[PDB]
Amino acid sequence: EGKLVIWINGDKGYNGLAEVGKKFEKDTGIKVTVEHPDKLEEKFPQVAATGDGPDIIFWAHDRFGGYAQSGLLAEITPDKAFQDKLYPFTWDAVRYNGKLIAYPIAVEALSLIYNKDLLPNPPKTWEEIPALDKELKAKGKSALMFNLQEPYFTWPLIAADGGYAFKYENGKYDIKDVGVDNAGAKAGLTFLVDLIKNKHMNADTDYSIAEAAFNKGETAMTINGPWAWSNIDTSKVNYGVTVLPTFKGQPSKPFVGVLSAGINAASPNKELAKEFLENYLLTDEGLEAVNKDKPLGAVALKSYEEELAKDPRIAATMENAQKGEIMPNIPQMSAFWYAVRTAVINAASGRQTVDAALAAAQTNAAAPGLHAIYGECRRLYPDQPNPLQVTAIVKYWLGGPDPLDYVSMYRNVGSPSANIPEHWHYISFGLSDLYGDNRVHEFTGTDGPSGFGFELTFRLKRETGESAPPTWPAELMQGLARYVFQSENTFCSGDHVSWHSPLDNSESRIQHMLLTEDPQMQPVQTPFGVVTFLQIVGVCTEELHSAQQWNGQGILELLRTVPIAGGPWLITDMRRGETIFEIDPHLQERVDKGIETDGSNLSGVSAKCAWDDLPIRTRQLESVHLKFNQESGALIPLCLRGRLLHGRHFTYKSITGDMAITFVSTGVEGAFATEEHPYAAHGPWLQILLTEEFVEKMLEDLEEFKLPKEYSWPEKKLKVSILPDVVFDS
């Protein structure tokens, strides 16, 4: 609005910012409003585009990387006079792609917390701690307790001797160069595991146990961030905060994240914001104002840190902050976090060796999505670690024709007791985000769908004495997958696919597909999003038609009741010769009611038909004669009962013509047919409006008699005929 609006999380000191907003108002006359709405990090991309976003946004740098790739943040341009007021490394935290995208405001870092009563002189090295633990154990106490389930707290030691996630040499992160496999990480984890083996620590320890312990006076030491402190103050423990122990002569690295403020690229007032950020907020007065209201922690302005630095506590956060590394901004951080955590836990529980866990972890950070899926696959099929797998040798993102990188092929023995035949279970890989580096699918985050948000599956009844699963279903999946990408049609459980081809290139009656949720596969959380599994179900042309006329869900249920045609898990039998309706005539009945009580999903059809026609004008007619093929005539009840009685339109379009006939219900909007003038036409396009009573009467009248079939009324006539449309006499 030419005024400055700021959105920030509910915890920090906005009133101080409001005071700075008042100070802004005094010196410049511009009103500064400060609000702190919920879930802002998610909201900013959503509203930033419209223009109702804030001019300035405050948050830890880790989000900003996402914001920067989406193009929501403006480049900031501070003079050297300014960049020198702040520490060089805080600027590093705000560089993406070599550009500066925010003013660093506050830095948070983990530190070593000790009880002054128990340990007057804290250890300067980790190697001392065992003996110290032994000493503390001597008086019924333990030395150290911290979260071993989350890598944020164990990474310093893992990072201590040379380990790293990504190295940025020019402000740009090399995503290939991962450092979870080197001697250092291995050194740290063996040491952690060794600490746990010698019962100096317990793999079970969590936030609350560690916190309860220090606050109750049960344990001697901890590692934590500023937020925890408030709770220790209430505990009245006399404690000091200092630098973390060194390992093998090198500093521990605690991830340091700096609260920063960025300027919205869609803001008119970018320069006002720059003036404000550089000359008012980043001053002793603005920061002091904010500090009194709610402490920021260790600030980024050298001058101000010195004022704050007497707090032994602040000193330690900044000592640790300088000694530690800055969090990466790329989205793959999410991938790193899942890998490590599993590695640490597995190494600590004895499930895996240190070398193997970190070796496994380095690799899993590369293609997490594939693996996460492999996880779900592993839960169902522990018996089959390696299944026959079709690989696309020419990868899609290098110009390849096949978008599914892998299709795994399993043998499911089934359950005879549940009437589930033995079958082959195909799972696809590529529709979801496997790699998460933007090679095929744009990265979206943990929230929201990974890639298209699903993978395809298929269940093919095993023929007797078949040694191996056939491969044609993979080619089918590739076909569908291409459609997904090109077609950009939504795929949800219940949707149908018109193929018109043998699914397996045989003479089978199964020539179409319906889609449903996989019976036994549960969806998964991959760092790049959520993945669900859509199973393909082979159907006959008649069954597809029923699905179109009613809905997919209903026909799926019908397929579940007839075991040969699907059963509870919907196994496709290509060899199947009968439709579900030929097997049980009463199923047709269930379909008709569904159409009655649900309406029909068919908005129109392409068929042989015509009406009497003849720079364009909307004509009105008092007489109308419609002509239909037997095939289209058959749908007239559906057109009337299914749509008009539910206030829904229906459209016939001529295969051979530009003619069209749209049956219109009352309450439809946008028709040029009125109750006053029911029959009207625009060029070859005809709309006819029918009142519900008339519709009911017509329905009674239509019901075998020899073609041609003629119906007549006091205003309109109808004919059903066959080859006349196909072949004219003139």
Author numbering: 5 to 618, 625 to 713, 720 to 746
Paste lines from the article.
Although the crystallized protein was intact, both SUFU molecules in the orthorhombic asymmetric unit show no apparent density for the C-terminal domain residues 279–360, suggesting that this region of the molecule is highly mobile. Since disorder often impacts crystal diffraction quality, we generated a new construct (MBP-SUFU-Δ) in which these 82 residues were replaced with a shorter seven-residue loop. This construct was expressed and purified in the same way as MBP-SUFU-FL and crystallized both in the presence (crystal form I) and absence (crystal form II) of maltose. The fold of MBP-SUFU-Δ is essentially the same as for the full-length protein, demonstrating that the disordered residues are not critical for protein folding or overall stability. Collectively, these results imply that the IDR in SUFU is dispensable for GLI binding and repression activity in cells without upstream pathway activation.
SUFU is an essential intracellular negative regulator of mammalian Hedgehog signalling and acts by binding and modulating the activity of GLI transcription factors. Hedgehog signalling plays a fundamental role in the control of metazoan development, cell proliferation and differentiation, as highlighted by the fact that its deregulation is associated with the development of many human tumours. Here, the crystal and small-angle X-ray scattering structures of full-length human SUFU and its complex with the key SYGHL motif conserved in all GLIs are reported. It is demonstrated that GLI binding is associated with major conformational changes in SUFU, including an intrinsically disordered loop that is also crucial for pathway activation.
